[PDB]
Design a protein around this ligand. Structure first.
Ligand SMILES: NC(=O)c1cc([N+](=O)[O-])ccc1NCc1ccc(O)cc1
Length: 294
């Protein structure tokens, strides 16, 4: 709009183009997201508007929702870097364990807050985890998935990443629960530790089979009800579960314990954000400041 002087093109999310913009008046620097079509559902705008009240230090603030000419703009507080970029920049030496722990602890606080307010993310990934020079990390796009929906790609021929998708979503479950976010975060925690994606599937089935190959093909024993799920097939190969010690070496037993609880197959057995915060892994948590090159 004419109220913003597009500084640059921050990128192209799974909803639309994102710009770093400066408020001509306030001078405020923000992230402006133009949402993808021909009318804008009033149900969507109401849902979105509710999110302006969902404020927490570990949640990227949604400053404004602007509906105009079949176009919807979301104005968000701006942060200089995402975790995907930071991990790549830290690929040679790895992110120090104290910082990994701090980030996981903060992300869990953010999740606990949203979940206590009955708001789910549903599409957590390194790119929507934003960080600043203060050692803070925040979750971006909370609640957008429900307020809207999800197509085959993003909106314009852009492959949607499935690497962080919970198995219940992959097996066709129609009702998501807060557990899907814990799964995604577990996958991200593993990636920060090993410096490699945990389950980098390139198709829905490859995603599911990569999970099965590591955690074992689920059955009625570990996941009651799994064989009755929409896309479950009796023909799925039966893989034995691997040792966590081989999954995220050289993570210590406190870390491996927490991760295994975040990756339980049964959404109901999967640990909650609130409960994870009390896990012994965080007994010595601190808040280190990252070396950020902007
Ligand atoms: N709220 C935000 O600040 C932000 C928003 C989205 N987004 O998709 O809504 C993506 C990245 C973001 N910042 C990190 C960033 C900043 C500058 C860059 O050049 C690249 C990444």
């Amino acid at each position: 709009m004419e109220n913003f002087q597009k500084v640059e093109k921050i990128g192209e999310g799974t909803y639309g183009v994102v710009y770093k913009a400066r408020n001509k008046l306030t001078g405020e620097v923000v992230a402006l997201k133009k949402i993808r079509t021909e009318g804008v559902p009033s149900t969507a705008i109401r849902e979105i508007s509710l999110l302006k009240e969902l404020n927490h230090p570990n949640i990227v603030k949604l400053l404004d929702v602007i509906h105009t000419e079949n176009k919807l703009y979301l104005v968000f507080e701006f942060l200089h870097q995402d975790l995907k970029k930071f991990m790549d920049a830290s690929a040679l030496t790895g992110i120090p364990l104290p910082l990994i722990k701090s980030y996981l602890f903060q992300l869990l606080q953010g999740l606990a807050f949203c979940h206590s307010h009955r708001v789910l993310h549903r599409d957590l990934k390194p790119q929507n985890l934003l960080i600043n020079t203060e050692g803070a990390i925040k979750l971006a796009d909370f609640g957008l998935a429900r307020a809207f929906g999800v197509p085959v790609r993003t909106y314009t021929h852009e492959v949607v990443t499935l690497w962080y998708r919970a198995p219940e979503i992959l097996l066709g479950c129609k009702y998501y629960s807060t557990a899907v976010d814990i799964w995604s975060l577990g996958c991200i925690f593993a990636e920060m530790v090993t410096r490699r994606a945990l389950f980098p599937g390139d198709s829905e089935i490859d995603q599911l089979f990569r999970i099965f190959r590591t955690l074992g093909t689920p059955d009625e024993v570990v996941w009651p009800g799994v064989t009755s799920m929409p896309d479950y097939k009796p023909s799925f190969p039966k893989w034995a579960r691997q040792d966590f010690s081989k999954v995220v070496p050289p993570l210590d037993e406190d870390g491996r314990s927490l991760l295994s609880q975040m990756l339980h197959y049964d959404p109901n057995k999967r640990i909650s954000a609130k409960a994870a915060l009390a896990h012994p892994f965080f007994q010595d948590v601190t808040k280190p400041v990252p070396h950020l090159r902007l």
